[PDB]
Design a protein around this ligand. Structure first.
Ligand SMILES: NC(=O)C1=CN([C@@H]2O[C@H](COP(=O)(O)OP(=O)(O)OC[C@H]3O[C@@H](n4cnc5c(N)ncnc54)[C@H](O)[C@@H]3O)[C@@H](O)[C@H]2O)C=CC1
Ligand code: NA
Length: 405
């Protein structure tokens, strides 16, 4: 009666939230990303020992897969996910990470993971301990956390991030993905306390605390390199993103990367860069006002140009061109740029024109909302080819070498 312990798992979506995840589908999604990387080919001169903070979904998962299956790296991942249990599917990041460990072992690559709050001292200590035991040191640290809150590791204060404009309220158009309607709403500007809290969570302090802690522990190698992911976006997103409260946080990253680069470049010519990536569908981005509509438009325009990319394609090129290659593709600030295809003037102009014309009636003629919906479901392991969604599956999937914080 093994079906008592198993279930048929279907999507249960509410706005930008899906409360279920499919273990087999997440495994298939991970395999697809791995197969992309191995199909593209290896990346020369990559790091061989990598710490990825935020390693279970989205860009961080893509970085772990790229490092491991592209650069041949041993990888230590840190993330914050819910394991499955009977009757209750775990989070997609849990199942993604289970799959990553399975495939890494098949290839003879080291994979160990730590599940817990990355903002906490405990998790940093557990991470230091794992590196010491296993790897000696790491050559690269990827900082790829997206979180709505942070408990300060010293004072215990809980900071909450806000996704609001700064200065003036803004009329933002968007797509209500449940009702499938184009709708506007007015978002009020952030208070100073809200801006400060957002910087506390998504700014660069914790990144700094990580690098310093690893440094003080002697677990970073000569020539070590670290990067945190950021988003600048097209001008149309500037009100809510770059010049909003979240932008105040990402701008803080810029006030961190200098000190970090300074510490590493003395340590064997190591380096640090904020890396700027394109918008993609993710658990994080889907929750940002305007983003489902913007993404649906951007996908259409970029597909027409042959330049559309998801997480894995974006990060593979970041490693190949910029982190390990001869094309930092530097901007005037010293950031690594991998987002130029989204920011091309002809792309921005086309997105802007469509933005002004889209209505309930022409959604499927003017946008790639179909593609948006598909990629969103894929995040949670749904709609993946070759997966039998009618078969019972055990939601309790275990991960070897998983340290629970
Ligand atoms: N998704 C997008 O359009 C873009 C995202 N970025 C940036 O890339 C980074 C990652 O974003 P996504 O891939 O979208 O996010 P995501 O939602 O797919 O993944 C976030 C990761 O952070 C982990 N995490 C969250 N809170 C944690 C905690 N307290 N302790 C340990 N782990 C925690 C999650 O487990 C997960 O691995 C972010 O800095 C984001 O700003 C930059 C360009 C655009
Ligand atoms: Na991530």
């Amino acid at each position: 009666g093994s079906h008592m312990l198993e279930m048929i798992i279907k999507p249960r979506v509410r706005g930008f939230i899906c409360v279920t995840a499919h273990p087999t589908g997440c495994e298939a999604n991970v395999k697809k990303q791995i197969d992309y990387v191995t199909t593209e080919g290896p990346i020369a001169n990559g790091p061989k020992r990598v710490l990825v903070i935020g390693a279970s979904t989205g860009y961080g998962l893509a970085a772990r897969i790229t490092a491991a299956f592209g650069c041949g790296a041993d990888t230590l991942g840190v993330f914050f996910e819910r394991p499955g249990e009977e009757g209750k599917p775990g989070t997609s990041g849990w199942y993604n990470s289970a799959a990553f460990h399975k495939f890494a072992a098949q290839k003879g690559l080291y994979a160990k993971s730590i599940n817990g709050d990355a903002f906490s001292d405990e998790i940093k200590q557990l991470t230091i301990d794992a590196i010491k035991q296993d790897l000696g040191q790491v050559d690269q640290v990827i900082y790829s956390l997206a979180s709505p809150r942070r408990t300060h590791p010293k004072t215990g204060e809980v900071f909450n991030s806000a996704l609001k404009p700064i200065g003036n309220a803004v009329n933002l158009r968007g797509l209500d993905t449940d009702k499938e309607v184009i709708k506007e709403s007015v978002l009020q500007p952030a208070t100073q306390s809200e801006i400060d809290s957002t910087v506390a969570v998504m700014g660069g302090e914790d990144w700094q605390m990580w690098i310093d802690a690893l440094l003080d522990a002697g677990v970073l190698a000569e020539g070590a390199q670290t990067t945190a992911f950021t988003y600048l976006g097209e001008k149309i997103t500037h009100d809510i993103y770059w010049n909003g409260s979240i932008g105040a946080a990402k701008k803080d990253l810029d006030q961190k990367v200098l000190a970090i680069r300074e510490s590493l470049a003395a340590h064997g010519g190591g380096d640090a860069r904020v890396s700027v990536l394109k918008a993609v569908v993710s658990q994080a981005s889907s929750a940002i006002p305007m983003m489902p509509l913007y993404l649906s438009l951007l996908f259409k325009v970029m597909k027409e140009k042959g330049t559309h990319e998801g997480c894995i394609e974006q990060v593979y090129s970041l490693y190949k061109d910029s982190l390990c290659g001869d094309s930092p593709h530097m901007d005037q600030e010293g950031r690594l740029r991998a987002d130029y295809k989204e920011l091309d003037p002809e792309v921005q102009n086309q997105v802007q024109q469509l933005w002004d014309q889209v209505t309930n009636d022409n959604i499927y003629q003017l946008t790639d909302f179909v593609g948006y919906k598909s990629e969103f479901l894929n995040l949670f392991g749904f709609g993946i080819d070759g997966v039998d969604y009618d078969a019972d599956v055990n939601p309790d999937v275990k991960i070897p070498n998983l340290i629970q914080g």
